[PDB]
Amino acid sequence: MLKIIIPTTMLLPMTWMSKHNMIWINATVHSLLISLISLSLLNQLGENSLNFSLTFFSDSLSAPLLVLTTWLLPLMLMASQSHLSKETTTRKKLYITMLILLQLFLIMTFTATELILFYILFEATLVPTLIIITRWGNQTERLNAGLYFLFYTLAGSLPLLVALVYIQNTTGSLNFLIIHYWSHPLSNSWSNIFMWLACIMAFMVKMPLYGLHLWLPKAHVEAPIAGSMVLAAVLLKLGGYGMMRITTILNPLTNYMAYPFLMLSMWGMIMTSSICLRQTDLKSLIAYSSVSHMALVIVAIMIQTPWSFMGATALMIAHGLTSSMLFCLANTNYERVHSRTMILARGLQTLLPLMATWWLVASLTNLALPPSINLIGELFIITASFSWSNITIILMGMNMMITALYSLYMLITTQRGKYTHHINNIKPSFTRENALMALHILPLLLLTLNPKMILGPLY
Amino acid sequence: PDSWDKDVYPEPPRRTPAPAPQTSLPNPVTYLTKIFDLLVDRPVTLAREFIEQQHAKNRYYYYHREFRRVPDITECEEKDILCMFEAEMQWRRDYKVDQEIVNIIQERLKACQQREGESYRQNCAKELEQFTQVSKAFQDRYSDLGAHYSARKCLAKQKQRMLAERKAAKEAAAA
Amino acid sequence: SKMELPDYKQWKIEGTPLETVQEKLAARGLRDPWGRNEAWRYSGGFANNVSFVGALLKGFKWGFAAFVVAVGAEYYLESQ
Amino acid sequence: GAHLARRYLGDASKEPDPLRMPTFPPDYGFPERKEREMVATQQEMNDAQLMLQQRDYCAHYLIQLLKCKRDSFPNFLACKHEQHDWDYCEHLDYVKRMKEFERERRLLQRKKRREQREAEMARG
Amino acid sequence: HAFFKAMLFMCSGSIIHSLNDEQDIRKMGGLYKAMPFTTTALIIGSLALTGMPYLTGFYSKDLIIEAVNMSYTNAWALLMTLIATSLTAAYSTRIIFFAFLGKPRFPPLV
Amino acid sequence: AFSAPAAYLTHQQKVLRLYKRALRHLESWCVHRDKYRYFACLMRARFDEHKNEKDMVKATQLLRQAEEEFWYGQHPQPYIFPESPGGTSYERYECYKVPEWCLDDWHPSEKAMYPDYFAKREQWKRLRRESWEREVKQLQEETPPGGPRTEALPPARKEGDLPPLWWHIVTRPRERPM
Amino acid sequence: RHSIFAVTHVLIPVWIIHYYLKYHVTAKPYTVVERKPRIFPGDTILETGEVIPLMKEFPDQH
Amino acid sequence: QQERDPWYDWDHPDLRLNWGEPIHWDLDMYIRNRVDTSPTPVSWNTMCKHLFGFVAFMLFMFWVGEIYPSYQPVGPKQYPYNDLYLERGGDPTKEPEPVVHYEI
Amino acid sequence: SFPKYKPSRLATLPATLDPAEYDISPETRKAQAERLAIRSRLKREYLLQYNDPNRLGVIEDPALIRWTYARSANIYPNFRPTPKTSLLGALFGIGPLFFWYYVFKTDRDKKEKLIQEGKLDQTFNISY
Amino acid sequence: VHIEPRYRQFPQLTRSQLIQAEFFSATMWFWILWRFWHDSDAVLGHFPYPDPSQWTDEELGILPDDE
Amino acid sequence: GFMLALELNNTTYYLKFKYPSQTYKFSNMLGYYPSIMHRLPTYHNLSMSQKSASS
Amino acid sequence: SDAPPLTLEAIKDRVLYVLKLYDKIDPEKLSVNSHFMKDLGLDSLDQVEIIMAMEDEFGFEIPDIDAEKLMCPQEIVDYIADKKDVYE
Ligand SMILES: CCCCCCCCCCCCCCCCCC(=O)OC[C@H](COP(=O)([O-])OCC(O)COP(=O)([O-])OC[C@@H](COC(=O)CCCCCCCCCCCCCCCCC)OC(=O)CCCCCCCCCCCCCCCCC)OC(=O)CCCCCCCCCCCCCCCCC
Ligand SMILES: CCCCCCCCCCCCCCCCC[C@@H](O)O[C@H](CO[C@H](O)CCCCCCCCCCCCCCC)COP(=O)(O)OCC[N+](C)(C)C
């Protein structure tokens, strides 16, 4: 596993020893090379994971997450170099250092064998994101949003630590393999109920679960393009990965304690999908759609069936790619008009046709158009929920109806109609932005031909 | 063809009727079939025979991997991790093999339904019975284990089923 | 291209239902000042139009002739 | 339908119910009924792959019609005799069904009339 | 239905194109002689749609009606089907009468 | 759509608008031409019946009842011209309308084609640039100190001037841009 | 140039499809399943040479 | 936004808005790609009455026609081999009750 | 004389049927003139920047910023806990959750009770 | 083909379109007449509807109201 | 249907004008289904999406 | 193809053609610069019908606030030319 970690570490002295006009080129090239190297982890087994050493291991669940995390960094560098042009060399290198540190922390988090190390890295990921949001954000709210990002997570994650060090004091180990093999049932008691709550809510906050989701429309909106990209694509999936990992020790209590969270998630799908219909901010609309999509993965993990787990993995990967592309597309318009109001700039299909095509593809993939992996994950989760309960089909389908509504609306408001007259500074799209959307969307369509690569260990 | 086994993928003797014409009009289907044979089939078989001659010049083989039988979870101690790991791997392999057996039976059923045409309800009772038996066995073994399944959970399910059967037998013997 | 408008003095309501409208309006003490403007809709090739049944039987005569000649030929040819 | 008007507007007990019919034994009035004869064997019907609704007492004529279709394929105007025979057999089946309907109807209007006459003969 | 419905729509589009993107039948006058081919095509299509015997629609629609008439059917469904069969000819007559018969009602620049 | 609106519509304008609307809806009802002419003459006689009413209250009441009668008797599906706000081709060609400033972002290879057109465009741009200050000064001097009471704009008054705020009116894309 | 279109858009695709079906698709069982041909009385089997007996002496109500 | 004059020279013709004028709290719902409050030739609460009455009458007539179906004066269709018992599912080891059809 | 038209929320009253346009006062004319003056001044202010050759970018509309700020950032500072607000929030945020919980619990208890006594016809239910 | 707008006159017509329309109308009518003369039973039926009142009580096996 | 449609269409040639009946208004406005179902449910959903769900 | 490129002379010819077909207007006294009120002695209701006749002639609708101002055929021709982007 060190063959991926060490080059990511070497990215730092490389960036700090590069020329003032050569940091972006070298960083992008070597991050793409690291992604190519990380592609080798997709060769998984059918019975047990890839145990590299006592500290790091890779399963079929963490391999696609690793690949996506390594792939996102070149895209973040490509999207960030536009608005950081007037920045000084030292601060450019500091921003690239923040991105590299975030990638390294995510790489170590997705492969840690022991739960305490996983928690340590999973919490260490907060610092670079907070620094990026609160230092390179554009508006005055970026400070407050930062606080919302910091204290929402910690208030959920601090009890988790108290749980973890407790478990090692009773079972003797926190290694995932030992925990899986030596699993024991959870008795129905208040102490076990609160231990279940402590081991779960830390991942519910990061999803975010409906009710504890207020930090996301702030953090995603006020963050820069790379911050929002890393927040939507990868940082939201940490909760899902941790919950899928830790639900082993929670049975059979998960049958009883999941009802409030299940109800919250199935109603939050409708609530957030309806909120998306009336949103004057485009970035806020994308952020709320992210919560609407993550509620489905919450339900899938809670119902605890193999089809649900496969659907959750596929939906996590697909949503990461789709949300990253949508945030990039919104940022392209923002860098022209310097406003996030959706109705300010209209009829952009006439002026930017290829960008309109990118918008159409992103919108179609967002609403789970078959045979995209978004649709595969959504349909697997729907079938698992229908097996869990038939009446669920009333809600999920309703959500689908709303999902296609606010998506195409978002496409109609910005791309169709007539252009606003007073705006006259809409320059043709650069090759960098078009390449960014192409690199966002081509793997998304490529993953259709090989879905088993992103279906998790339950395949 | 010899690519697959005919005992595992059976089919009826393929009775077909000989052409018996009644009118003097020409058959367009025969003319088009001759055109397809002369224009499409012959170049394809020529290219394939060339490819086969090329393949025959380099003959190398690949082997089916054989796995030894290791003790199951029933023979492992409570906290002995090594035999537990080996038994769990063997159980996962057996689970995959059972899945593929169910897949083969389902393929038989699908081929039956398509082949028999309008008499599929009567001429495919054997396939339906085989699928019902295999599905019942698979449901008894692996159903309701859920995610995070293991050999221990399957053993517990089998023990519970055996207790239920023993109680039912004792109740029946009291009459 | 290279065409000019027809003479405007030829548009007379004579022989058209605009005469009927003019008479029923004169029976009320009123006049139609725009009657000529519409006379072109009743003057030339638009003067006569077919009815619904005649429209349905557009090619009934020729088709019936073909049908009867074919039937007469076949009936006498069948008596070999 | 007339029968619909008579059943729905008149007395329903005087006319048959199509769902529950026939309500009388097949030998209630007939002195001797011979069993209906079927020409095509089950194996012939199975091999011809006839539809289950198409597998009726008129199946042999349908088999002949299908065979004549397949034999003279390019001339799709040749099976007039076979199609006519199959249609005539289906027509005979339909008139047999109508005969059964009328027999059942008049059996019902006869039975209740006899019972009411017996009751009236026992008034005093 | 595919055949005559598609060709009826092409006839409607031909009329619309020839009348300067005008789709209201109130401004379509006498096109029986002005557009003989489109007129005959729409007449044939309306006849086929209404179930004229031995046309394309006769071999399906009339058999459908006769099948509904001899089935254990909801009586209201049968009655509504017959009324719809009448209304089909009703609106075909509307189209033909208001698009091809009478006097022209379009702008004079032909 | 070119004329600046007024603060209110006088009685005469309201009656004229009602007359035009009633005639249009009557034509929608009376499909045939001669019937429409007959009933349009009837409606014109009905309107002329009270052409010289001097009682303003009575005139307003008559207009109110006429409006009520029209609203009750309006056609549910009135005829609309194809390019009218309700027509089938209202905003059909807006997707083909491209603003002229986009031509400033063309690559020099694209501007290599159509050289005379871009020379004339440069002449037009110079003419626009050279006359902006005079138009601003004219607007400042003509406008009352409180502000413009209406949206009407004054024409050019000197010899070498252009009417103020003329660029976007003159440089409209087209009615059929493609 | 007379019929170049008919070989680049029909002949090459049908060659490729026929090769893929004949030598790859049917290499696996049950990939191409055909409906059983209809067998009528009096038919002759091409495999075993069997002759299906006639349909039992029609009543001949003509 | 649909009720506003379409012949006015709006600053945003598609949205029918002028620059600087106050914007309705619910503009995004009235964008005229959406909910319309334009006056109708027939008043509300009359269209509702007509539509609900038509739908209820249709449903009640369909239920009545279900209660009073339409059929032909024929008996049940007769099938030769025990009502095609072997074809209709099978179970050849049962020998069901013989259904007997006689000529009439 | 004719069936009267009555307005509704989704079918508003037409301008021609509104009596306000048929009872005019000098103050009404003054109000209309003032509205026209405000609209004309706004139109002039917009057109001056719209036709400016030096201007490059987007003309900033204070009304749009006010609309977005009121819809997003001005809501909580102007919120007060009232019986109406508390009741509406409690209902619309709590009632649906317990309603769906009751529905799903009832259905799942029925299904589990059916499973326990072994009458559900779970044949061919391999995948879940 | 090159025809001009006429402005209140009947539009110019070509021989080909008129003869094609007439030919196709005649073809449709000939087809209808030919099929009717050959396949009348498809419209007027082929078999007669029997009258149930004409069936005797001996054909249907009906006892003479005394048994 | 052909005959009644033709007769009522030829009726329009007469010089008589009368206001439409309620049946014609129902038929022409598509049974008031778009006029109701595209306005009431859409308004209620779009109002609840902001008044309660968002605010 | 589509409609021919109509010109200024065509618009003027059509406008004068429609006006000459109006019974209240004498064709001889009618001119391009003839005012509808001063020269021809018409009223406002007549002007509305003239505008409607123009709309039916050219197949497009003129808004009332623009229609009230057109007082001679030359104004109508200029308005139609501005509508249809006719420069010659
Ligand atoms: C074979 C044995 C069977 C023999 C049967 C006996 C012989 C035939 C029976 C006669 C049946 C009707 C025939 C006359 C057609 C009507 C034409 C007409 O002028 O009508 C005048 C008038 C409309 O004329 P208008 O407004 O003055 O015209 C304006 C201009 O002309 C505007 O001009 P335009 O150019 O726009 O044209 C407008 C349009 C006409 O504009 C219209 O839309 C009005 C026409 C309505 C047609 C409705 C016919 C079927 C309706 C079925 C409804 C089912 C139940 C629904 C009830 C829901 C209750 C809420 O004109 C047309 O395009 C042609 C009209 C269609 C003619 C062809 C119709 C044939 C099919 C119907 C007859 C059935 C024959 C086959 C049956 C076979 C079965 C065995 O409508 C009516 O007054 C009568 C309508 C008939 C049904 C309405 C029933 C009363 C409604 C309220 C009842 C009380 C409800 C209380 C509350 C209950 C709550 C539970
Ligand atoms: C906005 C979203 C934020 C996140 C929301 C998270 C939801 C947390 C809720 C936890 C779900 C279950 C917790 C406890 C399980 C059952 C709870 C109780 O209602 O059940 C009864 C419990 O009985 C009584 O109700 C005791 C609880 C009453 C006191 C608790 C206060 C609950 C009020 C709601 C507080 C709001 C929660 C969120 C705080 C911010 C069952 O009766 P009993 O058979 O005897 O007990 C069985 C449990 N045993 C086995 C451990 C003994």
Ligand SMILES: CCCCCCCC/C=C\CCCCCCCC(=O)O[C@H](COC(=O)CCCCCCC/C=C/CCCCCCCC)COP(=O)(O)OCCN
């Ligand atoms: C953004 C908001 C997120 C909120 C996160 C906080 C919720 C976490 C839930 C409470 C965490 C406390 C659990 C600590 C770890 C549990 C480990 C454990 O099992 O210890 C239990 C003890 O469990 C406890 O003591 C925990 C009691 C709770 C103490 C702190 C109260 C905090 C609030 C609790 C209720 C709120 C929970 C939901 C919060 C909702 C937020 C919206 C048993 O220990 P023994 O003493 O050995 O008992 C067996 C031998 N007789």
Ligand SMILES: *OP(=O)(O)OCC(C)(C)[C@@H](O)C(=O)NCCC(=O)NCCSC(=O)CCCCCCCCCCC
């Ligand atoms: O000639 P101008 O100078 O242009 O002005 C003429 C006018 C008469 C308007 C003006 O000079 C004048 O003096 N107006 C006085 C007020 C007045 O005339 N009040 C009466 C209103 S007219 C009226 O009542 C018309 C009755 C017809 C009802 C119309 C509804 C149509 C039914 C719907 C058909 C579908």
